[PDB]
């Protein structure tokens with residue numbers, strides 16, 4: 001668990017299914033000949049972190065002091081680099097980066113970096129809060145992208161899909177989400193960002209039925225963390 | 236950290252550890268994220284190969300296990316579970332050094348076998364079989380364990396390490412005929428006694444004529460029971 005081992009901490013639990021999905025992806029995306037070749041990881045999946053959207057939109061209790069606590073726990077355990085598999089939680093990214101000893105890597109930049117340069121007009125599937133606070137907007141503008149978001153009726157259904165997956169019914173979530181993906185495509189999306197970490201779990205298996213490339217924010221962050229680990233002269 | 240947090244001392248291998256987290260989500264009833272089990276996970280895979288140590292004279296995993304155990308405790312884990320069957324060779328030693336509660340995969344798994352199944356197949360690593368980890372516990376319960384013959388066990392071992400290398404399709408081609416052989420030999424149930432096995436079998440249970448007992452899922456259920464036994468949870 002050495003710091004000199006370049007251990008990656010996952011500040012997770014938002015939600016727990018997305019965190020488990022990230023772990024599976026670290027295994028998938030890392031080239032390894034055996035157990036011992038995989039990436040060293042310490043994971044916090046401690047879900048009591050208050051709901052991010054309720055905080056931002058309703059003035060519910062802030063997740064910030066939980067994130068800070070669990071970040072220091074990971075650092076104290078030896079994590080040299082920290083990744084957060086929750087898009088909405090990146091509202092607090094800069095604040096956490098101010099207090100962090102460990103390197104931090106943003107899901108937002110990793111995700112935008114994984115969009116083909118030819119897709120200028122890009123759908124965005126995310127929580128109401130990620131949209132309302134514009135987490136992707138400045139970075140997308142800088143890259144010369146136009147973000148396409150579901151209109152109000154559609155967005156409510158996307159939000160319901162996310163929370164339905166969070167409650168554990170994937171089938172019901174899919175029936176809610178898939179029609180919203182087609183609407184984005186019908187409106188001209190050249191790719192669609194899955195900008196909430198439950199979305200890839202809902203979509204999994206249907207990519208073939210979907211006419212445009214889906215950009216997986218969780219997988220993008222995993223790839224970035226892998227590059228970070230692999231950059232070291234001793235790894 | 237959180238009250239009654241469960242540490243997972245994982246990474247053996249990492250795919251099985253990920254499978255364990257998925258199962259904690261599946262098997263816990265929760266109204267929302269905030270009702271899920273608090274977990275801190277070590278998946279730090281540099282732990283030396285368990286079977287290689289035991290049958291091949293390779294370096295011992297023990298000191299790694301002890302280190303990461305303390306790490307989890309220091310992070311606030313009050314109960315520790317290990318999603319590797321072969322690593323239970325060291326369970327008693329770890330429990331001695333542990334302040335936190337520990338829950339054995341072996342007992343959790345045997346306790347989930349239907350009482351009607353007397354003659355049970357066992358899919359596990361060579362080391363788990365050779366050191367008899369399941370053996371004494373099973374006999375106490377009146378079970379008779381059936382294991383593959385030499386040739387078949389080499390293929391089970393190959394399947395496990397093939398999954399560990401990341402090819403599930405090749406692992407399945409290797410494993411499935413060994414499952415059929417156990418049933419042909421009269422297995423009333425089969426213990427998947429290696430945490431990679433459920434990953435290989437997943438998607439095939441219907442094709443399989445007898446119940447498979449998932450060691451990972453058994454351990455998860457036992458940890459959930461431990462967590463829910465707290466009056467302040």
Ligand SMILES: OC[C@H]1O[C@@](CO)(O[C@H]2O[C@H](CO)[C@@H](O)[C@H](O)[C@H]2O)[C@@H](O)[C@@H]1O
Nearest residue numbers: 093094104105106107108109110139224
């Ligand atoms: O847009 C760049 C901006 O993003 C931040 C985090 O908000 O860092 C991200 O981008 C960097 C350069 O691409 C990466 O090295 C880094 O890992 C990623 O988090 C800021 O640091 C930076 O100003």
Ligand SMILES: [Mg+2]
Nearest residue numbers: 230231232235
């Ligand atoms: Mg390197």
